[PDB]
């Protein structure tokens with residue numbers, strides 16, 4: 001039987017590329033999405049056309065609330081319903097926007113940013129573990145220690161994610177569950193961001209003066225879930241072209 | 249006029265020692281507390297007996313909820329009402345218990361642990377900043393963030409989040425002359441509930457003296473960070489751990 | 498044409514497994530050795546028997562001295578003479594013994610330990626770069642660099658220096674398309690000398706499987722780093738440690 | 747009787763400020779120097795004029811060689827001869843220049859840079875320890891993980907220094923010897939550096955858009971050698987105005 005993976009926020013960009021590449025390796029995948037139903041289903045179609053009954057979608061808001069544990073339990077449950085197993089969890093979905101210290105309410109901002117980048121991954125990890133080459137891969141940030149100005153809540157989520165990656169690695173190791181991280185520097189830049197500001201980030205990158213493709217990020221995930229990484233756990237691999245190494 | 253400091257969870261242990269020592273340096277202090285009303289008021293009395301009208305208590309639950317921003321705003325507002333200013337904020341209050349991955353609900357656990365160690369400090373930072381000398385924030389971190397004790401995922405996440413905030417706030421508030429730093433105890437005063445044999449096992453682990461830090465030794469670093477001897481220091485986290493974090497398994 | 502790799506200290510253990518696995522991927526390899534001529538030549542035979550003219554040995558002492566630059570230049574030159582190119586450098590060779598602060602001279606201890614773990618890698622990096630497709634350097638680091646063994650100061654300094662080189666070379670050589678990365682074993686193949694009970698004490702420490710990494714598992718990460726699956730990776734150090742570095746004292 | 751400190755490279759800049767401030771706290775000091783004899787003795791006079799027989803100079807090259815252990819032993823020995831004790835060692839002296847990967851020989855470059863920033867501190871630590879509120883303070887670099895371009899050998903020394911700080915801390919703690927570090931971002935800039943380059947670095951600094959004075963660096967050293975840091979060991983305090991936190 002083929003192994004099965006959950007990728008959260010898998011409709012677009014890096015999430016999609018992870019899901020595709022996992023599928024190409026031989027995984028059956030649950031494409032999680034929140035608002036991008038059209039794109040999520042489109043990908044399920046494309047993947048099922050390649051091999052039948054190997055892709056399903058699952059809708060859930062990963063914002064922190066009273067229903068979030070239940071929601072995360074249901075994401076893991078859908079992988080078991082569809083595929084009879086869950087071998088891999090990739091924590092990709094992430095809310096990302098400025099929260100300056102000085103029209104959402106701040107408690108919504110907290111809920112979305114800490115919820116998506118930290119709490120959901122935590123609850124998903126709990127369920128993944130409860131329900132059992134098993135491994136979890138969290139998408140981190142090579143820039144966590146050199147954050148962007150006014151992104152404190154996001155940066156807190158990403159720092160919390162580092163903490164979870166290490167803590168889960170440690171606690172789940174007796175279960176043969178490896179927990180690791182992939183940390184993009186600048187990859188696909190926000191679709192909204194103007195081309196000029198995209199270029200300013202690109203010039204910063206030592207290796208090639210460009211962003212990572214989503215496939216290059218996916219490559220590291222693929223390595224981390226493979227048998228070439230059986231001893232690797234609690235490791236966060238920067239895939240950043242040397243960006244985090246550049247001084248101000 | 250004397251400067252003024254907010255210390256969260258200041259009724260006992262490390263919080264109390266920070267509040268006392270700040271007071272001894274010449275700060276007027278707001279003793280924040282949650283359940284320890286008796287001990288918080290006791291400390292206010294002791295400090296006011298030393299110098300009149302220099303200590304006040306403030307009650308607030310720092311659990312995450314939609315009203316926590318309002319609560320945190322009111323803590324900072326309490327310092328301005330009492331003392332007419334707020335020069336220092338020490339983020340000390342912290343929920344601490346295991347949350348294994350494998351009778352509180354998890355939603356409560358998340359709220360208490362992430363709320364106390366990260367979200368409250370974030371909101372308190374927001375208010376401190378907006379309400380504005382030598383201004384500085386000091387967050388109590390964990391020298392063991394990267395070698396967490398088993399099954400303390402939620403706590404460890406808060407503390408990691410605290411590291412992120414310490415650095416992010418440092419960076420954002422530096423144009424306001426507000427320094428943001430951290431003090432990172434290894435093992436200090438161990439939980440009152442913890443058995444003595446368990447306490448000893450941690451003590452033996454410590455390279456420098458095979459003992460825990462006194463609350464005073466933790467406070468000392470805070471005092472340094474708020475002083476003029478640290479005017480250029482920001483986004484720094486000082487381990488006060490006796491070398492614990494350096495010891496391999 | 499097949500690409501070519503230099504692996505230093507490749508006669509035994511982790512170095513041999515790296516060299517073997519690079520060869521199995523399709524690299525022609527220079528087996529560097531110091532003392533282990535018999536084993537180095539044995540591996541060259543084994544590899545050449547598999548594919549003819551794809552393995553050569555290269556003898557050099559990597560101890561620091563005024564002739565080490567020349568020696569390191571000659572190792573890189575040996576790969577160009579044999580194979581007409583040099584696509585990959587793996588910095589594996591490493592002296593490893595205690596140097597307590599409190600019968601070699603300390604001069605020799607410095608030279609061996611800092612020489613092998615830092616200065617040779619630096620000089621080899623220099624020559625690799627100067628003599629110039631998917632070009633990359635891989636340095637064997639230490640997942641325990643921040644929780645060192647007792648009395649291993651000189652070794653630990655070399656390994657910390659190696660971290661510095663990994664990052665600095667990454668940064669400087671990136672305009673040349675040369676990626677510099679690291680693989681950091683926790684406990685892998687333990688010293689042949691070490692008693693079995695001491696070996697077991699380390700093994701029990703490991704969260705993932707309570708065992709050491711095989712040399713093959715270390716090699717696997719090197720293979721990943723040199724591959725096209727890591728084209729955007731540089732200045733990254735991948736722990737291959739079974740969670741060891743995460744375990745508190 | 748008053749405690750005694752060795753400060754290496756104490757004739758100018760940060761070294762001088764450390765030595766002065768230690769003296770002001772009540773230490774007798776050994777001003778080590780290499781080329782700056784005039785400035786070193788000038789400071790000895792200034793300090794002895796303040797309190798008699800409290801300052802001595804000490805000439806030594808800290809370049810790596812087969813005589814360096816002997817030289818380092820003699821620096822520590824001079825403090826014992828002068829003052830009958832040695833309570834504090836401050837590892838400040840440091841060679842600093844580019845060593846690009848692509849007219850000194852490279853073996854000299856290695857010897858100066860690794861010798862000054864790492865090996866001398868190592869040997870001085872050895873002697874300090876063997877000869878016995880005792881503590882060692884090493885001058886590190888807040889930018890060690892975001893190095894300047896082409897400063898590989900320097901950066902290696904500084905990283906080696908981090909290793910030594912932590913390893914000595916751990917090994918010397920049973921002797922009551924605390925080992926810690928002070929990590930300047932941008933402090934006093936090289937005298938040679940032009941003013942506009944100096945400004946480019948200054949603008950990078952979040953806290954005040956200026957470099958640290960030598961005194962601000964010295965303040966942290968003073969804290970680390972004091973009774974207010976009795977439990978602190980293997981800690982490296984950044985004194986960098988937030989510089990290391992700024993992304994490219």
Ligand SMILES: NC(=O)c1ccc[n+]([C@@H]2O[C@H](COP(=O)([O-])OP(=O)(O)OC[C@H]3O[C@@H](n4cnc5c(N)ncnc54)[C@H](OP(=O)(O)O)[C@@H]3O)[C@@H](O)[C@H]2O)c1
Pocket residue numbers: 008009010011012013014015032033034035036037060061062063091092093094095096112116139140141142183184185186187188189190
């Ligand atoms: N791109 C980069 O340069 C970069 C750099 C560093 C780290 N990373 C990390 O890599 C991961 C992927 O990056 P990316 O740029 O592809 O991210 P992204 O497009 O910004 O977000 C990925 C997906 O997350 C989902 N999401 C957002 N808010 C959600 C919520 N409240 N509940 C449930 N799902 C939600 C969205 O799903 P729907 O569209 O279906 O609504 C979105 O498509 C993220 O974790 C990111 O932080 C990226």
Ligand SMILES: NC(=O)c1ccc[n+]([C@@H]2O[C@H](COP(=O)([O-])OP(=O)(O)OC[C@H]3O[C@@H](n4cnc5c(N)ncnc54)[C@H](OP(=O)(O)O)[C@@H]3O)[C@@H](O)[C@H]2O)c1
Pocket residue numbers: 256257258259260261262263280281282283284285308309310311339340341342343344360364388389390391432433434435436437438439
């Ligand atoms: N002690 C150590 O070995 C150690 C080690 C590393 C880091 N630290 C950090 O240093 C700080 C102080 O340590 P400690 O041992 O003194 O802490 P603690 O006694 O466990 O907690 C300090 C105070 O936090 C307050 N608190 C707890 N939950 C709260 C909530 N939901 N809302 C508002 N306040 C709440 C409590 O106030 P009330 O009593 O009034 O209810 C408590 O007295 C903490 O941040 C801790 O994480 C300590």
Ligand SMILES: NC(=O)c1ccc[n+]([C@@H]2O[C@H](COP(=O)([O-])OP(=O)(O)OC[C@H]3O[C@@H](n4cnc5c(N)ncnc54)[C@H](OP(=O)(O)O)[C@@H]3O)[C@@H](O)[C@H]2O)c1
Pocket residue numbers: 505506507508509510511512529530531532533534557558559560588589590591592593609613637638639640681682683684685686687688
């Ligand atoms: N094994 C582990 O648990 C572990 C853990 C962390 C990091 N690492 C790192 O991974 C790498 C390989 O580990 P290992 O255990 O396989 O290493 P090792 O056997 O101790 O050393 C590898 C080789 O280095 C060569 N070497 C030693 N001194 C030399 C000198 N002065 N000049 C030239 N070559 C010299 C030796 O070659 P000859 O035999 O031919 O003389 C030796 O075979 C090392 O860099 C090590 O520090 C290993």
Ligand SMILES: NC(=O)c1ccc[n+]([C@@H]2O[C@H](COP(=O)([O-])OP(=O)(O)OC[C@H]3O[C@@H](n4cnc5c(N)ncnc54)[C@H](OP(=O)(O)O)[C@@H]3O)[C@@H](O)[C@H]2O)c1
Pocket residue numbers: 754755756757758759760761778779780781782783806807808809837838839840841842858862885886887888929930931932933934935936
């Ligand atoms: N300045 C900064 O922005 C900055 C930033 C980060 C870290 N740091 C660290 O802080 C410390 C002091 O900084 P600094 O700018 O004051 O240093 P510096 O002026 O560049 O060097 C200090 C002294 O080191 C001595 N020295 C150099 N090479 C030597 C050798 N081969 N043998 C013996 N002594 C030698 C020199 O003594 P003589 O003049 O007598 O010959 C020099 O005066 C250094 O460790 C430095 O790396 C400084």
Ligand SMILES: Nc1nc(=O)c2nc(CNc3ccc(C(=O)N[C@@H](CCC(=O)O)C(=O)O)cc3)cnc2[nH]1
Pocket residue numbers: 094095096097098141148185186187188189190192193194197
């Ligand atoms: N979830 C997620 N999505 C991302 O697109 C992302 N990007 C990065 C690296 N990218 C960025 C992207 C934008 C800015 C930034 O300044 N963003 C402003 C856009 C300003 C503009 O568009 O002019 C923002 O509003 O988000 C910083 C880092 C890191 N983590 C991410 N995480």
Ligand SMILES: Nc1nc(=O)c2nc(CNc3ccc(C(=O)N[C@@H](CCC(=O)O)C(=O)O)cc3)cnc2[nH]1
Pocket residue numbers: 342343344345346390397434435436437438439441442443446
């Ligand atoms: N807020 C806070 N309070 C602390 O007491 C504290 N202590 C440490 C270091 N202390 C500890 C204390 C207990 C355990 C632990 O195993 N605690 C179990 C107690 C087990 C027992 O008492 O037998 C627990 O239930 O908390 C780990 C680290 C770190 N951060 C802290 N943070």
Ligand SMILES: Nc1nc(=O)c2nc(CNc3ccc(C(=O)N[C@@H](CCC(=O)O)C(=O)O)cc3)cnc2[nH]1
Pocket residue numbers: 591592593594595639646683684685686687688690691692695
């Ligand atoms: N080059 C290298 N070789 C290694 O074997 C090695 N091993 C580790 C992890 N291994 C170790 C091995 C031994 C000791 C240790 O206590 N060694 C004593 C042996 C004591 C005994 O054998 O009883 C020694 O003398 O080396 C610590 C960590 C890390 N880096 C390495 N680096």
Ligand SMILES: Nc1nc(=O)c2nc(CNc3ccc(C(=O)N[C@@H](CCC(=O)O)C(=O)O)cc3)cnc2[nH]1
Pocket residue numbers: 840841842843844887894931932933934935936938939940943
């Ligand atoms: N020992 C030491 N001395 C320093 O002056 C020093 N300065 C810094 C921060 N300062 C610097 C200073 C210069 C350059 C730099 O680009 N230096 C060139 C000067 C170029 C010019 O002057 O135009 C050099 O040649 O050193 C980088 C960081 C960090 N560590 C130090 N360490």
